[PDB]
C-alpha cells in the first residue's frame, strides 16, 4: 500500500524466526530501536504489527 494508507497486519499466535531476517543481505537498512536484533529469537511478544 501507499504511505498515506499504510497497511497494518496483525501478527499473533506464531513462532517467529528472526534469524532469516538478520542473515538476509537483501535489506539495505535493518535498524532496531527498543530491542537488540540478535535477542529477538530469545524473547516472547504480543501486539506485533507490520
Amino acid at each position: 500500500a501507499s504511505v498515506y494508507a499504510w497497511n497494518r497486519k496483525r501478527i499473533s499466535n506464531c513462532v517467529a524466526d528472526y534469524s532469516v531476517l538478520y542473515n538476509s543481505a537483501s535489506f539495505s537498512t535493518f535498524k532496531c530501536y527498543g530491542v537488540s536484533p540478535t535477542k529477538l529469537n530469545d524473547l516472547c511478544f504480543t501486539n506485533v504489527y507490520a
Binding site: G34, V35, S36, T38, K39, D42, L43
Partner: protein, 49 residues
C-alpha cells in the same frame, strides 16, 4: 499515644526502608526498571547506557 516517641523512630526507620525498596521500581529515565529486561533486550553498547 503514650509511647509515641519510640513508635516514631520505628515508623521512620521502616518508612526509610520502604522508600529505599520502592526506589528500585523507578527507571530514572531508562526504558525499564528491571535490569534483566535491559540485559535481555539490548546490545551491551546501549544496555551500558
Amino acid at each position: 499515644s503514650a509511647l509515641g516517641k519510640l513508635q516514631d523512630v520505628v515508623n521512620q526507620n521502616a518508612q526509610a526502608l520502604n522508600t529505599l525498596v520502592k526506589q528500585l521500581s523507578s527507571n530514572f529515565g531508562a526504558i525499564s526498571s528491571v535490569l534483566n529486561d535491559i540485559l535481555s533486550r539490548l546490545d551491551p553498547p546501549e544496555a551500558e547506557v
